Amino acid sequence: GXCSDPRXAWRC
Prior knowledge:
- One of its GO terms (cellular component) is extracellular region.
- GO terms for molecular function: acetylcholine receptor inhibitor activity; ion channel regulator activity; toxin activity.
- It is found in: Secreted.
- This is Alpha-conotoxin ImI.
- This protein has 12 residues and is largely without helices or strands.
- Helices cover 0% and strands 0% of the residues.
- It has no helix or strand.
């Protein structure tokens, strides 16, 4: 759920 998290989304 990396692309689901706002801060992890930057790496997606």
